[PDB]
Amino acid sequence: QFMQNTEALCDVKGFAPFSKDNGIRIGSRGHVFVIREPFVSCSPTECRTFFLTQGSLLNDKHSNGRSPYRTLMSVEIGQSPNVYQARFEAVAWSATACHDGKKWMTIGVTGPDAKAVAVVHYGGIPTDVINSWAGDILRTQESSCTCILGECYWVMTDGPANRQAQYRAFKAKQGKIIGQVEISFNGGHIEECSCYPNDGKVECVCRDNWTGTNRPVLVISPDLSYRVGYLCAGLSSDTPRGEDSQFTGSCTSPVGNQGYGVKGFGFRQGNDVWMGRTISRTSRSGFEILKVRNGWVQTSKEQIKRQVVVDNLNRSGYSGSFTLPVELTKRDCLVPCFWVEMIRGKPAEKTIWTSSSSIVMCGVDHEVADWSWHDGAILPFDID
Amino acid sequence: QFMQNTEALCDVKGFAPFSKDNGIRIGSRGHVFVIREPFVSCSPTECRTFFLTQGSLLNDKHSNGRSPYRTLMSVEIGQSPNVYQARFEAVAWSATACHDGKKWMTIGVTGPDAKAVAVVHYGGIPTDVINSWAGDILRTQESSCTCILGECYWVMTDGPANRQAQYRAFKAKQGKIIGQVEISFNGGHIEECSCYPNDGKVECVCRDNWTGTNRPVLVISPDLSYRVGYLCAGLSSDTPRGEDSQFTGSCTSPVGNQGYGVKGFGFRQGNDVWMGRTISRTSRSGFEILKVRNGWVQTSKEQIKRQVVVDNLNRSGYSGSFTLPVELTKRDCLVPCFWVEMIRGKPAEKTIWTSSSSIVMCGVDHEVADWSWHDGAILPFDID
Amino acid sequence: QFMQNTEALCDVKGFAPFSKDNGIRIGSRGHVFVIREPFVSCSPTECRTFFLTQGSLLNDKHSNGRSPYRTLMSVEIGQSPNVYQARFEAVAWSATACHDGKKWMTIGVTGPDAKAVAVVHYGGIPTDVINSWAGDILRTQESSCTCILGECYWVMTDGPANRQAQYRAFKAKQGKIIGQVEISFNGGHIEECSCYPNDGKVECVCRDNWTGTNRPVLVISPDLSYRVGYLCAGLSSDTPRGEDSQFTGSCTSPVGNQGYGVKGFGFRQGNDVWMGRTISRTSRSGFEILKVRNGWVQTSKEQIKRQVVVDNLNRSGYSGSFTLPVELTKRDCLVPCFWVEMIRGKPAEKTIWTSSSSIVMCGVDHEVADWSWHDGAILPFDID
Amino acid sequence: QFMQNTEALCDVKGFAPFSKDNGIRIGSRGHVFVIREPFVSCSPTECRTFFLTQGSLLNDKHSNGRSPYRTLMSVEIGQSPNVYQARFEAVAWSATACHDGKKWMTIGVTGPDAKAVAVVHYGGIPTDVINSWAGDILRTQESSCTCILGECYWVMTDGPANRQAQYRAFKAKQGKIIGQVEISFNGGHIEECSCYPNDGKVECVCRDNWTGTNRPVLVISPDLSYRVGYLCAGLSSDTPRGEDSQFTGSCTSPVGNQGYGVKGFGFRQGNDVWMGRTISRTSRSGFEILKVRNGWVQTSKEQIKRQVVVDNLNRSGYSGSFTLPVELTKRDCLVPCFWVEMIRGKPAEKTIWTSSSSIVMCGVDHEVADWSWHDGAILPFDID
């Protein structure tokens, strides 16, 4: 049976802690991959954490830091990314994964920068390929893809990381690419889309790495018509970004004139929006989630909820979205969840290596207090 | 199929050894979580050990000792709480878990002391939340919850650990809270209830951490009517406690005028009772189980059985109750079992860390000899 | 479905290598239990290796050598007895296990020498108990028990290890003891029986630790009538033993006037017999298997086959029997298999610890060449 | 259900990366077997990596280098050959394995050089044996065997490694040998065949270790009629070999007059051929795959595709073939895949040990760019 995933996303008032893997703490002694770019995706029976290894273990000389050793692997949600619980998925230095109700689809991108290859896998074997079409680091979401009615959808970019690039959406059935579309977005920039199903469409909130401090939004229909623009809200959710009091929103255009960025996410809540962001404006530190009234449709600054998940003295990193399927929840709507990556090590910290751990939160019908579920590893390590 | 668990508890004459995990011994070299608060709960197909990790491994610098790293995880009964066999359950510094016949329900409490959040999980995803209602360390059983006819029941406390607090019982179906009751117990104190099903009711034997050296008893009906009082028996089963020869029982009121306490358990046996206690009156050392004639209904001192499980030269700790379901036993009654936690390390011992291991015993129809299945680890460890 | 196991044992011409776990070699670096007394038993879907741990790991200070830490655990056949693949079965310093077609039955004996308790487990929970009836180390086979038509059978001893003791056979269904018999064997001694099904009976070949250099044989019928005596063959198969040229067989009585012994096995082959023995007469070194014409029924010295499995420069240890069920083989007969335990460490070798590894061989229809699949570990280890 | 595997092999234009296990990198710290001779084979539900351990772990003193410790084990494709994920298959210093749709068949050869024994296992138990028929290292493919319509086929050699030997093909059903044929190949030499199903036949491409720099080809029909010769193509694919510009092909006879060799593979593509080879002509370094027009039927030098997988500065080793079954792909043809073994350590490198890791590629309908997915371990290791 294919998962329909045609339901509305649930409207939620707060987010509760789902899991914490403690991967780095455990890796001081246990056998745990150096990783980065973790993400969560669910099947009808379980949620799993996916991650890009460096082909090396914490506290080993090989952790010394797009290589040909990076692989996509997965564990059950809340397990550390440890060697002896890991399932191999793909050769990959960029990836996305999702389940259609019947099997896991994973996409791993590997190969040379000038001519990369994305291998689509379905049920644990390779089934199709997409080669780079613009010759400049073909790359993808680093979070869950989205499956509706047995067809799965994802976004890729090829081109410069800091100026205009090219963006395509793809649709597959049972691991075969059956459609694609080029997304026209002159002046805009899309990287590392965080996508989820809502009302029979794929809604993605992405990263502008060129000039925008606000985030791109892309809404794809099953026939690959789409709409694209920027998240309307009058609060900026990229990093780096400027102060909220100097920010004016835009539904159409990049605002803030700053480079760089970080993968993040948001969720539509009718006309409102939940948006995540690092607490710091200049560095990947802290993590808060804000609900903004009419923030999906207008340049609103009307904050109605805020929750802190990692405090501002502690490192954060990427964040991303996924949903709980109704075959697990028995709800009439899709429950929205997110993860946060907490990066440790170089160059900010004096270590030879870099890795991350994660925390996962899911939408519930009550507000939840602020706290900090930070990484908690004690650096440097023995190897340093 | 839901488990009925409407049967009488079996009347048993002695307890036989079920498992011993040797977690600390194995942790001198293997990759094993620092834990405390282990417990056992069964499904129709297996028994599992649940435990609260410290987000760190034995013999690692992170084991140096309510943190945001503590997690609830589980293994099959008698496996050490090791990294590579562990199943992740919840973010938690207090917990309870049980199976309804179809899936595992777990509850993990995390967050700040002033405003904690308990996340209910069902079949490995979050499904409901209970926030602190009194603002002072919302907390729960640290042992098995109890499911009857597809509805599961547990006890929580919010308030002071050493004076009057507030106590509630909750009922859920498929991970959704469908009822709750405040337990009126003015002058009494309830913590860390050890509960089991008997004759279509939930019977719990708890810890009074305020003034009582005797244990509270709470009997909850499926409609959330209840009765509450103290275990009648004229022998005290908390620690610390006074000498038995200075003790007089009470069915209604705390006796002994001493603070502090330890999680323990008892089982009704018609009108008699099996009660566990540490052998020492002043410290968590040794473990014995006593059967007292009419001890459930009267202030009896008539001991009819005694069995030692850990001798008085060796550390003990918490203990708790669970039952074997009839779909495993094919009996006409629910078999009563208990576990004992054996704590090692600081402050009693000169180590930087604290953890525990466990032994599990089940009720049988013959008396079993005394012995000592103690922890057996050799301290200090390399890290110390 | 219960396994019938009513078929004749296959008549076999040689034995082929099934598995080798390399447990000690791997334990120089990996996380592997110190063990002894390994054995193999099969279900309709797989063969497993069972073993008695010391509650400690190789190369750790706890391996420094009937304790309360010993446990029965199991892995798939040919896996090292490593922590992260092990299934917990029982608290045990002596054990037996077997499958009835539906579930695993295990028996673990633990407790004090004067008053030990054997806990019967069935499908991973305790289900019955046998307490010591003579007050002197209740003990059992250390190899597979035998199930026929859904009823399982095993042998136990209680009493002195070096003079007359007492011996009982037990029958269980679904983990409940439904029958027992005392085996009258005045002047004889039975320990550590190696049993298998043949033609709807249980045939066991045991160890005489009192005066015999020949092995006891016990044949039990489903109704617990039995016959008992000694393996007829005019070659001695215990260790220690005398030279074959000074040996005369007996069907009825212990021969050779020597103490001590080692667990071993034999298989009836119509009127012939396969018998295992250490190659050395004085120490547990080497391992050979001999087929003797009419050796089951007469004091024959007519050797018709010989195969070496461990050469005489290498350590051996216990050996034992099990059979392959027809639901795995699709044969019309039960295939006979054996294992050999290869003990390493103290007192023979200069180490602080003692453990073993294993090799498993199964009966085939062709002769197989001699070789040596010895342990191969390099002692002492780092810990020594 | 038996797998038919009667379909044509798919005609493919390039090969995409399936997996990379990073076994040596991970083994610098993790618990990973010293191996060599890895290979991949698939069932209807998954692909697995098989490998011959040395009965020892990387970075341990036992890794110090046909022993009686070598075993055949397997993991899921892309897992390192680590202790705690490994499934035991056979005692083996040479091996082959394949699935018939219902169960795994494995063959492990062990024993003395003069009189080796090959044990056939089926569904995880031994089921038949083949003893050496020529008394000189009985040996087999070190890659996948081939199953068609429920019958499985493989090739073995017995005799000298460097002059004329003897070669047989065998057929089994459910682990029982039901047929065999001696392959007449006077003047030729066959070792380490790489076989796959194509159009209801078994096509194998092998290693000539006597005089040929070209590879033998053997095509076996289900009734054990066969044809044998050499791969026609006018490019040599063994190592060592001469320059392509001095090479003329032959369909019938060994060409190049050089000894030694390396296990490799090729795939028929109608009348064309994909052939793998090391990039170096003198050493096992680099790996490229070439498609040659009419290379199956004529001495063609017409190269139409080339892809590099390991560059020529990096070590390679053995390579081999397998196919994806239609029950995984839902295609109308069998997808061709190969693996490459990347050997590290002595004598080329200054270490006490030798092991390998692997990369796996599968046939797709687009060309894929050149890259290098080399081993990447940093030698020497701590133990050296």
Ligand SMILES: *[C@@H]1O[C@H](CO[C@@H]2O[C@@H](C)[C@@H](O)[C@@H](O)[C@@H]2O)[C@@H](O)[C@H](O)[C@H]1NC(C)=O
């Ligand atoms: C980590 O690596 C440092 C840099 O080494 C150099 O750069 C790398 C990329 C390689 O090409 C290597 O060959 C070069 O030597 C070292 O200088 C340093 O020793 C390393 N540190 C530790 C603790 O292993």
Ligand SMILES: *[C@@H]1O[C@H](CO[C@@H]2O[C@@H](C)[C@@H](O)[C@@H](O)[C@@H]2O)[C@@H](O)[C@H](O)[C@H]1NC(C)=O
């Ligand atoms: C264990 O920790 C001891 C105390 O350290 C101090 O307190 C903790 C809570 C942290 O805030 C830390 O920053 C402080 O330094 C140490 O003094 C001691 O080194 C540690 N021992 C070992 C063996 O790791």
Ligand SMILES: *[C@@H]1O[C@H](CO[C@@H]2O[C@@H](C)[C@@H](O)[C@@H](O)[C@@H]2O)[C@@H](O)[C@H](O)[C@H]1NC(C)=O
């Ligand atoms: C192994 O143990 C040796 C003997 O120790 C003594 O006997 C044991 C049974 C215990 O009671 C212990 O308390 C006694 O100290 C030691 O002398 C020796 O250090 C140990 N060796 C190693 C390498 O750990």
Ligand SMILES: *[C@@H]1O[C@H](CO[C@@H]2O[C@@H](C)[C@@H](O)[C@@H](O)[C@@H]2O)[C@@H](O)[C@H](O)[C@H]1NC(C)=O
């Ligand atoms: C590795 O082994 C070297 C050679 O040792 C000798 O040869 C082997 C086959 C055995 O017979 C052994 O008994 C002999 O001693 C050693 O000389 C060397 O120490 C070893 N190296 C390390 C680092 O373990």
Ligand SMILES: CCC(CC)O[C@@H]1C=C(C(=O)O)C[C@H](N)[C@H]1NC(C)=O
């Ligand atoms: C190459 C552009 C890309 C998106 C901005 O840079 C990413 C940014 C990163 C970052 O900002 O942390 C690390 C990513 N692993 C990297 N992606 C790849 C494929 O290299």
Ligand SMILES: CCC(CC)O[C@@H]1C=C(C(=O)O)C[C@H](N)[C@H]1NC(C)=O
């Ligand atoms: C906070 C009061 C509570 C019950 C008395 O104290 C417990 C006692 C403990 C103890 O007495 O050993 C340790 C428990 N982990 C702690 N519980 C929590 C949630 O912190």
Ligand SMILES: CCC(CC)O[C@@H]1C=C(C(=O)O)C[C@H](N)[C@H]1NC(C)=O
């Ligand atoms: C206690 C008598 C018994 C049988 C002879 O001794 C056995 C001999 C042993 C041996 O000879 O190797 C080791 C066994 N683990 C031991 N059994 C127990 C339960 O201790």
Ligand SMILES: CCC(CC)O[C@@H]1C=C(C(=O)O)C[C@H](N)[C@H]1NC(C)=O
């Ligand atoms: C014995 C001849 C054989 C085929 C040429 O040599 C092989 C070559 C090898 C090699 O060339 O790398 C290593 C193999 N493990 C070895 N096979 C066996 C069974 O020893």
Ligand SMILES: [Ca+2]
């Ligand atoms: Ca930006």
Ligand SMILES: [Ca+2]
């Ligand atoms: Ca108290």
Ligand SMILES: [Ca+2]
């Ligand atoms: Ca004897």
Ligand SMILES: [Ca+2]
């Ligand atoms: Ca050659």
